[PDB]
Design a protein around this ligand. Sequence first.
Ligand SMILES: O=C(Nc1nccc2[nH]c(-c3c(Cl)cccc3Cl)nc12)C1CC1
Length: 295
Amino acid sequence: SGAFEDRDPTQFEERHLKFLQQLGKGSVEMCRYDPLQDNTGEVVAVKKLQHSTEEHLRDFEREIEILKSLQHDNIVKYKGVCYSAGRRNLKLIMEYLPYGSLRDYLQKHKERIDHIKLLQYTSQICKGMEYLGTKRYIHRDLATRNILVENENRVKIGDFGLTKVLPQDKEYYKVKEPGESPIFWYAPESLTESKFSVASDVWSFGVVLYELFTYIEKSKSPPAEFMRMIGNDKQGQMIVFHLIELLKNNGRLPRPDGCPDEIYMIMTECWNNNVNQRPSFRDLALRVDQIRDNM
Ligand SMILES: O=C(Nc1nccc2[nH]c(-c3c(Cl)cccc3Cl)nc12)C1CC1
């Protein structure tokens, strides 16, 4: 009955997006996009909300804009949007990464992980973060659970739902928000003052590096280790009070078993209370690639 002109490959048609699997609960599904009706098509990941409140939808739209603005080998690829429920709902379309989160990959695929691989992932994470800096984006949620694995040789930063954009003349973003924070990845100034910056991303990167070198041994996770240092029985605000006091006076995650001193030195430089003395992501990428190249 109708003629058709497609001038926007970023608009995925609801009727052609076919369910493959539930990936985790926002919630993410794996789907097949099959406009040619032939039982094939590209496999994609689809992110949807739980509640489309004026607030959550505005945030979701901002996350979509953020992801769309990014094009880099070490950042999850934006593919498009689907305006489902007859154009009364919104879903984000992105590339599907077969190995899932780095946290899970390290846990489930120890057979294929050595220090060479760990430094390769470290390098790629720094380069993705360098790229975010050029956009003046502050991620605020760097952790191995939020980094995704394409294959043995490539990891990508995901999870842009907390990302903030710095105005031209500003060097930090103060954000007070209700609910739970990933406190064991937070820099001291984020804990005490809700201040986020490239330098606070560098602090969190230090924790990521720690996570890599612990191989996600369940007992060695940042929450497990900090809670052991703080006291395992502590609950609620008391945890935060003790974490802050600990960090302000140089309490730090321990060197993981089998971690070279030079790699631990990188973590400890990231974990500087003095914001301005933390290294840049460019400094880190160079140092890590030089370590890699010098063997
Ligand atoms: O889930 C998989 N791959 C994935 N591909 C593409 C995008 C993906 N986003 C996630 C994801 C999930 Cl479900 C929960 C929390 C945090 C993240 Cl970052 N996972 C994604 C593989 C394991 C089946």
